[PDB]
Design a protein around this ligand. Structure first.
Ligand code: CO
Ligand code: CO
Lengths: 332, 332
């Protein structure tokens, strides 16, 4: 039973110059210290966030995986890489380049390192083509952000994308990104603590309340990252609203709670009680170990929360290993 | 064994002529049908919200309360009545009129209907007066919105108000309103299902992360409406952030979860799993029965989720009765 950690991120060796050729102001690149141990994601000439070797170096990453007890990691774009606001053809060329970097990263050891691709989701046609190209080149699926500006997952272009993926057997991880909140949540990591869980919840409900699960084939494999946000906990509020209000019930024929059999969530909720309630709502078959390696708010002892739960042995094995193996078809 | 519902709402019997005196376009009033069981809250000459008789009629309410098994009910402003956008002086006099109306509604049976007052929270001076004035007139505390625009509860102006209330032993109920989310939650009541819980979590976290509870006297009686949103379930994430980023730890000298003994939440969470998680977090002494009567999304069998739960008889008596008795000082 190899521990599979199915939610982690990477960032490729791109220089200022290469990024500039796409967008001098908005294309992210990687600055590495002379020493080679630390670095920063840059945007234009500005420091975006500080980072360390494990995000760009697959050999260094292998050492930490050994140290952690992680046998297989699935890793994908850092969300600042998405480029969802750029011109389509440019975002397409970018996506391909990033996905190639991701394959080259995993080529260091394709047994223990699996990658998901990004897509120019602003353009449905180009997004489908990149999704297919990348999977047929080695990627085990796609990571998308959870919205495109004012477009949420109920949007016909995003629904059409999920449907293409269901049709071609391409798993999706939905990652919250580009957080709401306007001006309100600047200090103390509030976008991460408030807006992010709200974003993921909104993605799920957008699928549910629009009736989109009635249209998307049941074969779609889709996981919502970062514990599904606050979804599991406020689901009661949503069923209540659906039972008692026309406008809530209108596009959604079955109790919202019944739609949990249509998706997955990762396990990153940082609390025993939250995990227990997460597993209660979703069922043990629908929660997968994800850490958010190698960022600093990520689970520092990968799998620790699950292995130390008062869940059954049966269930623990599915969450740390079983489910993702099936979900991503990583042949154990 | 007396049942106390501490979260319900009311709307006064204001004539269109009396409303137009404050603001012909933005000041809320009540239109009542022939039969006398139907109404609309209006904004000028437009239908703002359709409402039913229990919202404005004490006699009718007094009877649903008899039907429901609720001995005492705390009631307060519908958030449309807040008028936080108004000019400080126009609001002060609006607040007083709403609060004279609230005391009239209470006077129909002051043993069973208790009231909280609204305040012109935009101007500190006028809000403190109205608070002390309203309480001494018979109000048991105040209801405040969770934010004013981008001033969250970490705003020093708002702190001072919380502290002014603390020393007068004026209890406060913090209610979500004016939900974040802009152009993104237009259907299926998503403001209420996504933004509302996030607002309330924000409100709590701005107190904890800013260090406000270090500076507000422990005598503060403050309660966060609607279960405190997603607060209890996301709390583990908050501690994780605190432990791993020193910017989260800067004004918050102890782990964020330690401050749970500084506030209360109501019980309105619509799921037994969620109720259990909520109590586990807050403690059985810090959760009060609130229904959100008489709104359609309000609990239909008031007390029903608590009374059917797997909690002990001791826990149930505190939530239904014990806690709210002490908090609002309603003597049995
Ligand atoms: Co992540
Ligand atoms: Co309410």
């Amino acid at each position: 039973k190899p521990r599979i950690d199915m939610h982690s991120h990477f960032f490729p060796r791109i220089s200022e110059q290469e990024a500039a050729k796409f967008d001098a102001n908005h294309a992210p690149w990687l600055q590495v210290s002379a020493k080679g141990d630390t670095g920063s994601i840059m945007m234009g000439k500005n420091n975006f966030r500080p980072v360390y070797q494990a995000l760009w170096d697959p050999a260094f990453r292998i050492e930490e995986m050994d140290a952690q007890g992680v046998d297989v990691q699935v890793t994908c774009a850092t969300p600042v890489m998405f480029g969802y606001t750029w011109e389509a053809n440019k975002a397409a060329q970018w996506a391909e380049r990033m996905n190639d970097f991701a394959l080259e990263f995993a080529a260091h050891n394709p047994q223990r390192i699996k990658v998901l691709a990004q897509v120019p989701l602003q353009d449905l046609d180009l997004a489908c083509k990149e999704a297919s190209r990348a999977v047929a080149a080695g990627h085990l699926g796609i990571q998308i952000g959870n919205h495109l500006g004012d477009k949420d997952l109920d949007d016909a272009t995003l629904e059409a994308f999920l449907t293409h993926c269901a049709n071609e057997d391409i798993p999706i991880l939905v990652h919250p990104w580009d957080m709401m909140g306007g001006q309100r949540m600047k200090k103390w990591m509030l976008p991460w603590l408030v807006a992010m869980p709200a974003e993921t919840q909104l993605a799920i409900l957008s699928l549910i309340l629009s009736g989109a699960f009635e249209r998307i084939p049941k074969s779609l494999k889709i996981c919502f990252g970062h514990g599904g946000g606050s979804f599991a906990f406020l689901l009661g509020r949503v069923d209540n609203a659906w039972r008692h209000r026309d406008i809530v019930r209108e596009d959604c024929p079955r109790p919202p709670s019944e739609y949990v059999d249509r998706f997955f969530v990762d396990s990153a909720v940082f609390n025993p009680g939250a995990l227990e309630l997460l597993v209660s709502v979703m069922g043990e078959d629908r929660v997968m170990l994800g850490s958010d390696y190698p960022f600093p708010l990520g689970e520092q002892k990968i799998g620790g929360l699950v292995l130390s739960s008062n869940l059954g042995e049966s269930a623990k094995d599915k969450i740390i290993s079983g489910n993702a193996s099936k979900f991503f078809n990583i042949n154990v």
